[PDB]
Structures are given as structure tokens and as C-alpha cells.
Ligand binder design. Structure first.
Ligand SMILES: *[C@@H]1O[C@H](CO)[C@@H](O[C@@H]2O[C@H](CO)[C@@H](O[C@@H]3O[C@H](CO[C@H]4O[C@H](CO)[C@@H](O)[C@H](O[C@H]5O[C@H](CO)[C@@H](O)[C@H](O)[C@@H]5O[C@H]5O[C@H](CO)[C@@H](O)[C@H](O)[C@@H]5O)[C@@H]4O)[C@@H](O)[C@H](O[C@H]4O[C@H](CO)[C@@H](O)[C@H](O)[C@@H]4O[C@H]4O[C@H](CO)[C@@H](O)[C@H](O)[C@@H]4O)[C@@H]3O)[C@H](O)[C@H]2NC(C)=O)[C@H](O)[C@H]1NC(C)=O
Ligand SMILES: Cn1c(COc2cc(Cl)c(C#N)cc2-c2cc(OC3CC3)ccc2F)n[nH]c1=O
Ligand SMILES: [Ca+2]
Ligand SMILES: [Ca+2]
Ligand code: NA
Ligand code: NA
Ligand SMILES: [Zn+2]
Length: 805
């Protein structure tokens, strides 16, 4: 119930929300059906429109007008945005040359430059260039400030997950807004775009920027605008708020546009009808900047122009129907569209079975435009699994397609020509970032980055301490003139042991064999030096990774590679080696095919054993340092040490062996050498974080050898590829992956073909940031470079996307 007979007189767009049943005058009251009776009359005035004209200049103040052109309007803070231009001979902001803003130039009483976030729904990254002729205000912001060529959204590339990610710095799995539609089984409640349940506070986890600000004594304008409030009125409301007295005035503001998304759905991303919405958004930007110029705030405020996601061409005819695959289609509930999420229609049906649904959806049609996954098998870069609102069965839909349950769902709901929601590495889903203001850099282009990083920066721009989030604070310091955040490297928690030769061969009873009993003071001193670390500067280029948790591990040196060997997990946490451009690939000789050799530095009790692999009919093994890349026949023996062995399903070995035999050398040739760090990952609870020993769900049969869920590699070289990887003076270049360790290759529909037709494709799907691997291993990489730490943080957040330009 609302008692709507209170009044909004003097309360229009009040910042504090008053309590039911008392009627509301804030910019949300419409959305709750709670505004006071006179809200439209007082707060949504429209008379005479939004622009001054010569005849209105000087006019007698009429309080009915939407905005004012009278002489007292500047002092009142409610002039039309073009007032000084029409009436006082001033230029529009867009017509002024840009001039570097070296320091904030702010009115007296201003404690800090305010921040205005100008968010645009569905603003695809390529609009900045493709629409630049019709967006002159945005183009000035872009060219004069700091811009990225694009910004990567989070998955799913839908509105609310992305806007809330912007506000919180959190992946959707952590903030809880995992789609525009959701079912939460603990609450037994549904979240929808339409209607009221979405305002219930239990949906919204983490701590958004407005709450962070408020808790630290920084006042915030509203972030949500009711759709019926016109854009011109949103802008005038912000400008009015900026004219409040110092004790009442907010420091952070947001504007939101429903465009160009609204039109992009109807017309496609580049429909000829899209020009006008881009013109209109640019006009709104111009109103804001003209309004700030009038208030003398245009060289004081930091402005962020940012989108939530892009827009792709999608039509009704490009729909796959689950009724063409499943017999049981009425026993499921599908969240449809540009992603699929499946669960049982009824929790009373014990005949429901995910394995049979997955199998019925796997590689069934030759051009099939979706791929099913148990959520824990989705690419780890998506960070889309650790929330009870994400259904166990997921369909990753190809760009340009939809999935639906049955045809009747599509024609009883062609209308649309655009949609979004796809995998966040798809080029059409990329969106925009521009920062303009005293705290941003001048005429600066920065590389593409992920929207999860912005919360930290917005916190820095307002002097706030960010709440815990998934950004890497410092990774965007290169966007900023000042207010940089100067982090220190985390302290190492566990220091390594450096074991020497402590065990005789006969102490081992591992069931392993090796044809190796074959024999010199010249080369005996030499192999001793390699086991003490004499080649380690070549193989460990950026220092040893730091272990950020309590554990017991050994550093093991060898001619061709260095490793950190875990006594707890019985395998390396990491293995580091450098392959020059000139390295040669050799085979595993016949006599060494089944060779595994005890490591005399490491006790039997802290070693793997071959009997386990013999007994485990499902499990085989691989090696972290590949025998194919040994520097010499004698060095090759090192690669067969039991301390370099890891558990691998035979199906996964096809992937791994192709990576190691073909791809590493290919990358060294293309990149002028590479440094490779490889290792296992254990994430049985799919939380994106290193598992402890007691979370491991699978072991090599009959043993304590834990089975990884994933294998990673981090592949580093010189950005200036005229320098070899091992003699690089400047910035680094990286690509990494986190490959799922699966007992089948059902993910790869073409896996019966030669690995040259499908392995690399799989690896690109599972591309990762170094930071993703850090979370999953508790390791900290690149500890010893000649580079700045901020630069290294940027490197650690880089994702190699494999999309064209
Ligand atoms: C991305 O960044 C985020 C933020 O930094 C990272 O997320 C954090 O990760 C931590 C580890 O997973 C986690 O720490 C736990 O916090 C528990 C208390 O948490 C509550 O309070 C916080 C702070 O105000 C709040 O933010 C939380 O909100 C969650 O839950 C509500 C819904 O109920 C949502 O509104 C919200 O969206 C959020 O959900 C998300 O997080 C939870 C996990 O907290 C998930 O379950 C959801 O799926 C969703 O993703 C909370 O309300 C604390 O109790 C935990 O402590 C246990 O474990 C420690 C280990 O040392 C142990 O000492 C204790 O014994 C304790 O165990 C006991 O409980 C166990 C579980 O019931 C039980 O089995 C045991 O036997 C014990 O009895 C723990 O410290 C932190 O809360 C989240 N924060 C957020 C915001 O998500 C995230 O990791 C980053 N991602 C990557 C990939 O890096
Ligand atoms: C989508 N949309 C908006 C714009 O919303 C936001 C704009 C920005 Cl710039 C940011 C950031 N950072 C955050 C939001 C936002 C606001 C919310 O408010 C709670 C009452 C629900 C909830 C989630 C959000 F993510 N207004 N109207 C409308 O339809
Ligand atoms: Ca959107
Ligand atoms: Ca885990
Ligand atoms: Na086996
Ligand atoms: Na297959
Ligand atoms: Zn949309």
C-alpha cells in the first residue's frame, strides 16, 4: 500500500528514499507505483521543451517550464543546457578545441572531482569508429581523453549481469545476477526483467559502488532511472544535484541510456535505423557537457562513457530447437535465447538424468550451432559455475544463433534482428570505454581490458577503499594521471626445499622400469652443475613463482627445465622451461617408451608409482616437461623422472602430446623463443580457487595420486619479437590456457580427425589470463622482471582472444 496524498513540493528527485506507506518523490517511485499524486506535475515538467531560444533569453521566470532561460537560472542551477550558448554568446563544448586538463579546475567548496558514469546499453565497440561522423561529442570525449579500442564484458553478455558487474567489480557467479532471468532454488523464487521481485535485496550480492561510497561518507546520486523519465530530465536532474550546497551534493552520479540496445534488437547492430539512436545519444552527451561547462565543471568532473555489452545479428530463423534432439522435451525447463540453461521441470521426477540430456545434445547434427556443457566444464575464463542459480546444464550458443525448447516458443511470443548474451570473447559482444577528466590521461589509448576492473578505478577516482572484488587493483593504473594505487607483491608463504641426492635406487619400489643403465669427469661435473641450477637463468626467466599458501615443496633443477614439486600432491605445482627459436624436436626413442625413473632427490614415500597407473584401467600419464624438446640425448633422461609425471586420461593425452610435440615449437618459431610454465589445477568445487587436499574427489586408483581437473600453460615471450624470449629488454607478451582434463573428447566434434584439425581450436576456447591460473593454483608469477609492477598486473590480466580485429 501507498498513501499517495503526501506531496513532492520541494522534494523532486530527493536522494534519501522515504518509507512506506508515505509517498515517494525519488527517481524510483514510478517503478514501485509509489510516487505522490503531484510527482508528474512538479517533477516531470515538459513545458516549452528542453532548449532555450532567442525569444526566451532574459524571460520572466515561469516555474511551469521544463528548464529556464531567465537571468536567475544559473544561480538556481536549472537553466536549459544550451542557455549560455543561445543567450550569452558561448560555444557548445563540442566546438571548443580540446586542451589538456593537467589539474582539476573546480569551484570553491568542491572536496574532490565528481564522477559521472554515462552508461549506454548495447553500445557495441565498433560503433566508436563506424558511427564517429554522427557522434561528435562522444568522438571528442574519445579522442581527447583516455580510451580503449574496446572493453570486454562478462558472461553472459546481458544487461543486468554486466551493469551490476560494473557496479561491484564481481563476476556474476559471485554477485548473484547470473542472467536477466533466474530461479533460485533455496528461495524457490524467480527473477524477471518485468515486475517487482527483482527489487528484492536478496538477489543483489557484493557491494555496489553507491553503497561503498555511502559507507565511506561519499554521497551518491541514484544509479537506476525509471524508463519513463526522459533523458533530458535525467541530465537536468544531475546538473541540479551538482548545484546543491557542499554538504548535500553527491560526488558520484550515473546516467543510463536504454539505447542503442532497444533499437539494435529490432534492426540489428548496423541496421540503417541505428544512425538516429546514435545521433540521439550523442546529443545527450552534448547536453551534459554543455551543462557542465555552464556550471564551470567541465574541467573538474571525471566522466566515464561505458557500455554493458554489444549486439549481434540474430533472426528467428537461426534458432535450434531442443525438440529436434530430445524425446523427453516436456520434462525440462530451458532458459532460452543466446545461452541455454536446463533443469528438471519437476524435482519429483527421479527419471530425470543430466547425463542422457547432455549425450542427446552432443554432436548430433553436423552444423549444430550450440554445444552442451556441465557448468564445471565451461571454459574457466567465463567464471560461470559457482552459484546455485546457474543450472548444471549449460548450452553455449554460437554467435548469430538462438536455442529454444520447441518451435511454438519462437512464433507464439519474426520480430527481432539483434541480440546479445554470447560468449564474452566474441567481437560483436565487445563494448566501449572512454574516460575523460583531470584524473584520466590526455589523448591516450590503452589496450582492451575487462569491465570487472572498473570498480577499483571508480573507487580510486573517489578516494574510496574498494570492497573485495575480482578486479586486480593496479592493472588499470595506466589509465590514470594521478590517484594510482600502488600495490605490493604478495608475500611468499612457503619457502621451498632444495634437496640434493638423498636416496639410492634400490630404496624405490614403484613398479617402474627404464632401459637406462648406460655410462667421465668432464661431463660428470657438468651434469652435477645442471642438478644444482646452472641453466636455471635460461629456464626460469621471471623468477620462481611464489607459493601463497602453506605447503611442503621442493625445487628440482635440470638441464632443460626447473620445477616446484609438491610433496603433498606428489607432482609439480609448476614446471618452467625455455624453447628457443632454434630448438629441435626429437622423438621419444624406442628403448625409453615406457621409461619412468626414480628421482634420487625425493623420497619413495613422496613419489608417484607406476603400479597405480598399471592398475587404473582408465588413467594413463604424461609429462610436464616434454621429452620431445630435450636439448640432447643425455638430457632426455631427465624428462622421464617420476617427479615430472602427471596423471592423464588417454583421451587427454592426444591433446597434450600435440601441444608439446607440435605447438610449443610452432610458438617458439613464431614468437622468437617461448618460456613455458605448465602445471596441474585442482578445482573440484568449481569455485575458481585452488583446492585444498581434502577437496580432491578423484585419485589414481588405489593410490594417493590426486587427479587434476585441468592442466595450464603460461607462454611468455618478448613483445618486441626481434628479441629472443631469453634476452628481452622491454615488455613481455603472454598467452595462456587452462585445459579441462577430461576422459573423452566429446567437446570436440571433430576429434576422430588428426589433432591438426581440432586441438588448437580446443585450446583457443580455453584461453586464460595468468590471473585465472593464479587463483586456481595459489601461485604468483612474474616476481622477478625488470618491469613495473603495474605493468605486470596488466600482463597478468591479458587474455589472448583469438578473434580477428
Ligand atoms: C571474486 O571475488 C569475490 C569477493 O572477494 C570472491 O568471493 C569471496 O570468496 C570467499 C571464498 O569462496 C568467500 O569467503 C567466505 O565467506 C563466508 C561469509 O560470507 C558472507 O558474507 C560476505 C561478506 O559480507 C558476503 O559477501 C557473502 O555473500 C554471498 O552469499 C549471498 C547469498 O547467500 C549472496 O548475496 C552473494 O551473492 C554471495 O554469494 C556468492 O558467494 C558465496 C560464498 O560466500 C557462494 O556460496 C555463492 O555461490 C556466490 O558465489 C556471504 O553472505 C564465510 O562463512 C566462509 O567461511 C568458511 O570457510 C572457511 C575457510 O577458511 C572456514 O574457515 C570456515 O570454517 C567457513 O566454513 C564453515 O561453513 C562452510 C560452508 O557452509 C562449512 O562447510 C564448514 O564446515 C564451516 O561450518 C568464507 O570465508 C567470500 O564470502 C566471497 N565473497 C563474495 C562477495 O562472493 C571470489 O572468490 C572471487 N573469485 C575468484 C575466481 O577469484
Ligand atoms: C538498467 N537500468 C538502469 C541503470 O542501472 C545501472 C547503471 C549503472 Cl551505470 C550501474 C553501474 N555501475 C549500475 C546500475 C544498476 C542499478 C540498479 O538498481 C537497483 C534498483 C534495482 C541495479 C543494478 C544495476 F546494475 N536504470 N534503469 C534501468 O532500467
Ligand atoms: Ca544491456
Ligand atoms: Ca576450488
Ligand atoms: Na592405466
Ligand atoms: Na569428439
Ligand atoms: Zn538488449
Amino acid at each position: 500500500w501507498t498513501a499517495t496524498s503526501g506531496s513532492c513540493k520541494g522534494r523532486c528527485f530527493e536522494l534519501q528514499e522515504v518509507g512506506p506507506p508515505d509517498c515517494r518523490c525519488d527517481n524510483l517511485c514510478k517503478s514501485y507505483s509509489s510516487c505522490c499524486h503531484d510527482f508528474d506535475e512538479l517533477c516531470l515538467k515538459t513545458a516549452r521543451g528542453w532548449e532555450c531560444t532567442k525569444d526566451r533569453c532574459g524571460e520572466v521566470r515561469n516555474e511551469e517550464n521544463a528548464c529556464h532561460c531567465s537571468e536567475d537560472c544559473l544561480s538556481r542551477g536549472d537553466c536549459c543546457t544550451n542557455y549560455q550558448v543561445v543567450c550569452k554568446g558561448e560555444s557548445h563544448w563540442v566546438d571548443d578545441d580540446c586542451e589538456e586538463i593537467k589539474v582539476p579546475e573546480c569551484p570553491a567548496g568542491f572536496v574532490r572531482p565528481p564522477l559521472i558514469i554515462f552508461s549506454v546499453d548495447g553500445f557495441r565497440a565498433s560503433y566508436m569508429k563506424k558511427g564517429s561522423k554522427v557522434m561528435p561529442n562522444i568522438e571528442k570525449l574519445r579522442s581527447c581523453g583516455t580510451h580503449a579500442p574496446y572493453m570486454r564484458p562478462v558472461y553472459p553478455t546481458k544487461t543486468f549481469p554486466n551493469l551490476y558487474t560494473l557496479a561491484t567489480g564481481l563476476y556474476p557467479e559471485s554477485h548473484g545476477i547470473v542472467g536477466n532471468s533466474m530461479y533460485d532454488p533455496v528461495f524457490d523464487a524467480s527473477f524477471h526483467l518485468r515486475g517487482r521481485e527483482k527489487f528484492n535485496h536478496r538477489w543483489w550480492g557484493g557491494q555496489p559502488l553507491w553503497i561503498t561510497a555511502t559507507k565511506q561518507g561519499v554521497r551518491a546520486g541514484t544509479f537506476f532511472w525509471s524508463v519513463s523519465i526522459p533523458h533530458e530530465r535525467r541530465i537536468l536532474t544531475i546538473l541540479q544535484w551538482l548545484s546543491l550546497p557542499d554538504n548535500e551534493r553527491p560526488s558520484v552520479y550515473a546516467f543510463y541510456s536504454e539505447q542503442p540496445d532497444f533499437s539494435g534488437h529490432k534492426y540489428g547492430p548496423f541496421g540503417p535505423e541505428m544512425t538516429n539512436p546514435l545521433r540521439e545519444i550523442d546529443k545527450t552527451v552534448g547536453q551534459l557537457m554543455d551543462g557542465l561547462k555552464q556550471l564551470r565543471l567541465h574541467r573538474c568532473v571525471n566522466v566515464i562513457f561505458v557500455g554493458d555489452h554489444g549486439m549481434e545479428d540474430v533472426t528467428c530463423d537461426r534458432t535450434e530447437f531442443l525438440s529436434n534432439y530430445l524425446t523427453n522435451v516436456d520434462d525440462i525447463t530451458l532458459v532460452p535465447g543466446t545461452l541455454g540453461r536446463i533443469r528438471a521441470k519437476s524435482i519429483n521426477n527421479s527419471k530425470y538424468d543430466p547425463k542422457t540430456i547432455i549425450a542427446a545434445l552432443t554432436c548430433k547434427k553436423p552444423d549444430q550451432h550450440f554445444k552442451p556443457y556441465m557448468k564445471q566444464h565451461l571454459p574457466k575464463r567465463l567464471h560461470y559455475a559457482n552459484n546455485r542459480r546457474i543450472e548444471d546444464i549449460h548450452l553455449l550458443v554460437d554467435r548469430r544463433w538462438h536455442v529454444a525448447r520447441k518451435p511454438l516458443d519462437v512464433y507464439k511470443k519474426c520480430f527481432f534482428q539483434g541480440d546479445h548474451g554470447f560468449d564474452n570473447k566474441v567481437n560483436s559482444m565487445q563494448t566501449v570505454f572512454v574516460g575523460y577528466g583531470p584524473t584520466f590521461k590526455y589523448r591516450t589509448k590503452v589496450p582492451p581490458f575487462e569491465n570487472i576492473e572498473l570498480y577499483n578505478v571508480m573507487c580510486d577516482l573517489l578516494g574510496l577503499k574498494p570492497a573485495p572484488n575480482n578486479g586486480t587493483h593496479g592493472s588499470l593504473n595506466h589509465l590514470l594521471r594521478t590517484n594510482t594505487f600502488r600495490p605490493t607483491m604478495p608475500d611468499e608463504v612457503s619457502r621451498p626445499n632444495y634437496p640434493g641426492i638423498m636416496y639410492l635406487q634400490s630404496e624405490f619400489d614403484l613398479g617402474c622400469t627404464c632401459d637406462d643403465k648406460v655410462e667421465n669427469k668432464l661431463e660428470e661435473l657438468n651434469k652435477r652443475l645442471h642438478t644444482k641450477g646452472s641453466t636455471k637463468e635460461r629456464h626460469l626467466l621471471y623468477g620462481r613463482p611464489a607459493v601463497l599458501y602453506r605447503t611442503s615443496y621442493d625445487i628440482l633443477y635440470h638441464t632443460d627445465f626447473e620445477s616446484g614439486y609438491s610433496e603433498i600432491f606428489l607432482m609439480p605445482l609448476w614446471t618452467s622451461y625455455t624453447i628457443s627459436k632454434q630448438a629441435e624436436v626429437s622423438s621419444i626413442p624406442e628403448h625409453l617408451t615406457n621409461c619412468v625413473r626414480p628421482d634420487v632427490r625425493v623420497s619413495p614415500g613422496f613419489s608417484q608409482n607406476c603400479l597405480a597407473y598399471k592398475n587404473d584401467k582408465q588413467m594413463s600419464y604424461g609429462f610436464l616437461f616434454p621429452p620431445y624438446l630435450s636439448s640432447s640425448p643425455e638430457a632426455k633422461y631427465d624428462a622421464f623422472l617420476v617427479t615430472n609425471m602427471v596423471p592423464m586420461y588417454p583421451a587427454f593425452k592426444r591433446v597434450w602430446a600435440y601441444f608439446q610435440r607440435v605447438l610449443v615449437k610452432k610458438y617458439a618459431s613464431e614468437r622468437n623463443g617461448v618460456n613455458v610454465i605448465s602445471g596441474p589445477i585442482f578445482d573440484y568445487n568449481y569455485d575458481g580457487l585452488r583446492d585444498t587436499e581434502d577437496e580432491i574427489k578423484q585419485y589414481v586408483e588405489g593410490s594417493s595420486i590426486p587427479v587434476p581437473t585441468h592442466y595450464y600453460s603460461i607462454i611468455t615471450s618478448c613483445l618486441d619479437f626481434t628479441q629472443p624470449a631469453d634476452k628481452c629488454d622491454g615488455p613481455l607478451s603472454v598467452s595462456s590456457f587452462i585445459l579441462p582434463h577430461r576422459p573423452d573428447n566429446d567437446e570436440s566434434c571433430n576429434s576422430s580427425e588428426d589433432e591438426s584439425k581440432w586441438v588448437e581450436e580446443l585450446m583457443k576456447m580455453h584461453t586464460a589470463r595468468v590471473r585465472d591460473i593464479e587463483h586456481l593454483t595459489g601461485l604468483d608469477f612474474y616476481r622477478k622482471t625488470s618491469r613495473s609492477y603495474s605493468e605486470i598486473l596488466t600482463l597478468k590480466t591479458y587474455l589472448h582472444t583469438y578473434e580477428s580485429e
